[PDB]
């Protein structure tokens, strides 16, 4: 009979793995394409330095990680362990972004 872990074990293993490293977690080329697509709506034929895209990606990852940290607190307050769109909405409303 094959070996299987119970649900939740590998999730905690990944939490421990990623809370210890410091590397980026999104793909460079798709992120660059997205930045260049967004930039077209304000000016045409723009150029980007190499370090500008790195700075943008760093800021974006930090922002999303903080947002998820607050969403988890909302979900636990509701007596749950699964996060939800309403949790994200409540966190943003209290932070004042909406």
């Amino acid at each position: 009979k094959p070996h299987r872990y119970r649900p939740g074990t590998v999730a905690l293993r990944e939490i421990r793995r990623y809370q210890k490293s410091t590397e980026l977690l999104i793909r460079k080329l798709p992120f660059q394409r997205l930045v260049r697509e967004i930039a077209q709506d304000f000016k045409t034929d723009l150029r980007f330095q190499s370090s500008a895209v790195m700075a943008l990606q760093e800021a974006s990852e930090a922002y999303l990680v903080g947002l998820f940290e607050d969403t988890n607190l909302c979900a636990i307050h509701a007596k749950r362990v699964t996060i939800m769109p309403k949790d994200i909405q409540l966190a943003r409303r209290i932070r004042g972004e909406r």
Partner: protein
């Protein structure tokens, strides 16, 4: 259609660093919209700085100033 380059595994890695144990299936579409709004806000100010400087290239200093103007100071790029 470049917002689809941000994939479900990458969103899951970000959540795992945030400390989330279980995720529902409707989170990804919401996260994509949040990111799009944030990026629009920062990039508009960066382009305004570039246009005042009379350049055709966005630099790292423009991004740093744009982030600082929004209460999001960043270290290690200038």
């Amino acid at each position: 259609d470049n917002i689809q380059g941000i994939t479900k595994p990458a969103i899951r890695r970000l959540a795992r660093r945030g400390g989330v144990k279980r995720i529902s299936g409707l989170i990804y579409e919401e996260t994509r919209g949040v990111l799009k709004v944030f990026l629009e806000n920062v990039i508009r100010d960066a382009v305004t700085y570039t246009e005042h400087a009379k350049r055709k290239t966005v630099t790292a200093m423009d991004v740093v100033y744009a982030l600082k103007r929004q209460g999001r100071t960043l270290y290690g790029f200038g």
